[PDB]
Amino acid sequence: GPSVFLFPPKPKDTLMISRTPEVTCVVVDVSHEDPEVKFNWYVDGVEVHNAKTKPREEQYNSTYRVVSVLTVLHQDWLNGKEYKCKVSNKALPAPIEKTISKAKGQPREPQVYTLPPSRDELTKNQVSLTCLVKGFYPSDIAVEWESNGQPENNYKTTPPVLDSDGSFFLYSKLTVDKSRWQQGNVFSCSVMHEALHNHYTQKSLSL
Amino acid sequence: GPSVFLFPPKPKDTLMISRTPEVTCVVVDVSHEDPEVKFNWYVDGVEVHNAKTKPREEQYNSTYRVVSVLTVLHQDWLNGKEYKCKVSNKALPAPIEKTISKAKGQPREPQVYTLPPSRDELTKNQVSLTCLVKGFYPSDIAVEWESNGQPENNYKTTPPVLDSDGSFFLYSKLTVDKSRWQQGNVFSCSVMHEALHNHYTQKSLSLS
Numbered sequence: 506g507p508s509v510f511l512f513p514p515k516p517k518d519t520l521m522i523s524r525t526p527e528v529t530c531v532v533v534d535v536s537h538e539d540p541e542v543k544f545n546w547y548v549d550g551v552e553v554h555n556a557k558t559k560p561r562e563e564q565y566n567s568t569y570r571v572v573s574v575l576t577v578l579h580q581d582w583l584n585g586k587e588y589k590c591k592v593s594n595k596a597l598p599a600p601i602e603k604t605i606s607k608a609k610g611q612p613r614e615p616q617v618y619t620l621p622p623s624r625d626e627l628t629k630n631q632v633s634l635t636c637l638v639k640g641f642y643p644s645d646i647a648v649e650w651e652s653n654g655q656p657e658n659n660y661k662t663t664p665p666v667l668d669s670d671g672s673f674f675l676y677s678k679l680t681v682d683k684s685r686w687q688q689g690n691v692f693s694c695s696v697m698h699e700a701l702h703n704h705y706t707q708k709s710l711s712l
Numbered sequence: 713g714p715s716v717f718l719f720p721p722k723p724k725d726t727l728m729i730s731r732t733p734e735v736t737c738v739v740v741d742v743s744h745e746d747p748e749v750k751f752n753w754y755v756d757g758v759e760v761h762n763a764k765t766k767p768r769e770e771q772y773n774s775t776y777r778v779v780s781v782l783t784v785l786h787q788d789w790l791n792g793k794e795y796k797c798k799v800s801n802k803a804l805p806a807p808i809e810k811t812i813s814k815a816k817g818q819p820r821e822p823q824v825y826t827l828p829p830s831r832d833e834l835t836k837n838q839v840s841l842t843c844l845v846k847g848f849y850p851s852d853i854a855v856e857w858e859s860n861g862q863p864e865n866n867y868k869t870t871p872p873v874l875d876s877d878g879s880f881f882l883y884s885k886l887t888v889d890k891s892r893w894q895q896g897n898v899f900s901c902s903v904m905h906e907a908l909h910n911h912y913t914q915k916s917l918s919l920s
């Protein structure tokens with residue numbers, strides 16, 4: 506019967522001592538006939554006992570959805586430990602095991618480049634300030650914009666794209682009124698990633 | 713029983729009259745017990761009979777895969793016609809139908825901007841040339857880089873991203889030997905989209 510899907514923590518959660526990163530083991534197609542779901546968890550094959558199973562939930566195709574959440578240590582995740590969720594159930598001929606970790610391999614530091622609007626774009630009422638972030642690994646990253654000790658929120662960031670050397674790049678675009686740019690205001694692209702000192706860097710971009 | 717997947721044509725194929733846009737209806741998990749598959753195709757709910765359906769082909773997991781390809785008119789696709797593939801097979805309770813069509817909304821012309829390398833990147837052996845393409849709708853688009861009439865190949869383009877105004881943008885990044893940039897070679901970002909004049913525009917980039 507059942508199917509298991511196992512999900513990683515969010516990039517920022519693994520990078521900030523403040524946040525709590527979780528791995529989540531989701532089970533679907535739990536039948537009303539066989540509702541008792543058991544989870545065992547292992548960190549590098551070592552069984553651990555701190556996961557938290559949430560109460561079951563009725564789905565609308567007559568099956569239950571049962572979730573187990575395991576909180577992980579930042580340094581454990583970042584050092585590449587493997588988290589295995591093993592799901593046991595009367596409906597199965599064998600337990601179902603899923604394993605997840607941070608993407609494997611040597612982390613690489615983002616290079617961050619800010620690019621002013623094109624002269625062609627300066628004919629519009631709003632312009633694009635571009636932040637190119639390239640050469641990073643793994644793809645988990647978070648990008649933001651600020652100006653004058655203030656956060657700018659009118660930006661959108663592409664997903665990471667796999668580049669030809671196996672690292673990733675993305676672009677983040679901040680849209681601003683042209684006049685804010687022409688006055689010489691300074692804007693900055695902020696990036697958080699494993700491979701940066703203090704997990705953090707910024708580059709400025711002004712006229 | 714069987715499953716059906718219905719795929720659109722490629723955006724450059726719908727935009728250039730020299731290419732042939734096709735909609736592809738694929739059926740998989742066809743059993744030995746019920747091997748016969750029939751396709752009916754509809755365009756805006758009107759049956760058509762001009763599809764090219766291929767003989768079933770047995771897969772290494774001993775199921776059949778059967779494909780039907782309907783060639784579409786370039787202007788039919790861009791005019792938003794709806795293409796429906798209906799698949800009958802004895803193992804099914806009812807035929808399976810899928811429908812596909814261009815995204816709905818008004819078309820918007822892409823704005824294309826080329827941006828040179830950052831000075832900070834001039835310490836590297838390779839440099840990044842950037843093409844920003846923004847303000848476009850629908851998201852179907854094709855982008856490439858050329859120099860001296862020869863197509864570049866060492867570039868990568870982001871997927872289109874929904875912008876705050878409901879249009880899309882993307883960026884394409886071309887990587888080049890820094891010395892080709894230094895020499896003053898000209899590079900061009902070329903863009904094809906339905907809301908451009910003649911479905912095509914090109915913007916050039918070079919040093920100074």
Ligand SMILES: *[C@@H]1O[C@H](CO[C@H]2O[C@@H](C)[C@@H](O)[C@@H](O)[C@@H]2O)[C@@H](O[C@@H]2O[C@H](CO)[C@@H](O[C@@H]3O[C@H](CO[C@H]4O[C@H](CO)[C@@H](O)[C@H](O)[C@@H]4O[C@@H]4O[C@H](CO)[C@@H](O[C@@H]5O[C@H](CO)[C@H](O)[C@H](O)[C@H]5O)[C@H](O)[C@H]4NC(C)=O)[C@@H](O)[C@H](O[C@H]4O[C@H](CO)[C@@H](O)[C@H](O)[C@@H]4O[C@@H]4O[C@H](CO)[C@@H](O[C@@H]5O[C@H](CO)[C@H](O)[C@H](O)[C@H]5O)[C@H](O)[C@H]4NC(C)=O)[C@@H]3O)[C@H](O)[C@H]2NC(C)=O)[C@H](O)[C@H]1NC(C)=O
Nearest residue numbers: 508512513514515526527528529531533534564565566568
């Ligand atoms: C019944 O019912 C149910 C339910 O229902 C529901 O639904 C809907 C529709 C409606 O109906 C309503 O009613 C409701 O709501 C069902 O269930 C279902 O199921 C299915 C299955 O079948 C599933 O699916 C899946 O999914 C996935 C995903 O999912 C996700 O997402 C979605 C959307 O998007 C959603 O929905 C969900 O929910 C999810 O979400 C998530 O969650 C999580 C958890 O919680 C989270 O996380 C978290 O968070 C938090 C906060 O919040 C924190 O942060 C923490 O830390 C964390 O953890 C998140 O966030 C979220 N997200 C979002 C976005 O939201 C997908 O994934 C999958 O897919 C897969 O599978 C399939 C098959 O099956 C396929 O097709 C696909 O493709 C895939 O596959 C895969 O692939 C991949 C690739 O890519 C792979 O890997 C790989 O490999 C390869 C080759 O080898 C390569 O190499 C690469 O590289 C690698 O990586 C893999 O392997 C594979 N896998 C497999 C298995 O195969 C699926 O799809 C769903 O989910 C469900 N739902 C739910 C809700 O759950 C059922 O089914 C029914 N029944 C019947 C009978 O029908």
Ligand SMILES: *[C@@H]1O[C@H](CO[C@H]2O[C@@H](C)[C@@H](O)[C@@H](O)[C@@H]2O)[C@@H](O[C@@H]2O[C@H](CO)[C@@H](O[C@@H]3O[C@H](CO[C@H]4O[C@H](CO)[C@@H](O)[C@H](O)[C@@H]4O[C@@H]4O[C@H](CO)[C@@H](O[C@@H]5O[C@H](CO)[C@H](O)[C@H](O)[C@H]5O)[C@H](O)[C@H]4NC(C)=O)[C@@H](O)[C@H](O[C@H]4O[C@H](CO)[C@@H](O)[C@H](O)[C@@H]4O[C@@H]4O[C@H](CO)[C@@H](O)[C@H](O)[C@H]4NC(C)=O)[C@@H]3O)[C@H](O)[C@H]2NC(C)=O)[C@H](O)[C@H]1NC(C)=O
Nearest residue numbers: 717719720721722733734735736738740741771772773775
């Ligand atoms: C037995 O073997 C079968 C054959 O498999 C072979 O391969 C081996 C590895 C091995 O398995 C062999 O035994 C065997 O030889 C196997 O068939 C497979 O079944 C799967 C289903 O179980 C199919 O999975 C789907 O794949 C879709 C994407 O398929 C494309 O991409 C993959 C590679 O990524 C490729 O392998 C496929 O061939 C297909 O390629 C596309 O092909 C089209 C058609 O030709 C091309 O378009 C044409 O291109 C030409 C020029 O080439 C021209 O331009 C034409 O104009 C143009 O139309 C594309 O270019 C080409 N693309 C690429 C990238 O190559 C998935 O999209 C699909 O996902 C959807 O459904 C899932 C449910 O199953 C769901 O989880 C998923 O989220 C998604 O759901 C959709 O979600 C969307 C979100 O918006 C919704 O919008 C949709 O509505 C929704 N869909 C639905 C149905 O609701 C799915 O994963 C797989 O294609 C198929 N393989 C083949 C080769 O057909 C079979 O399973 C085996 N059986 C058993 C029991 O093992």
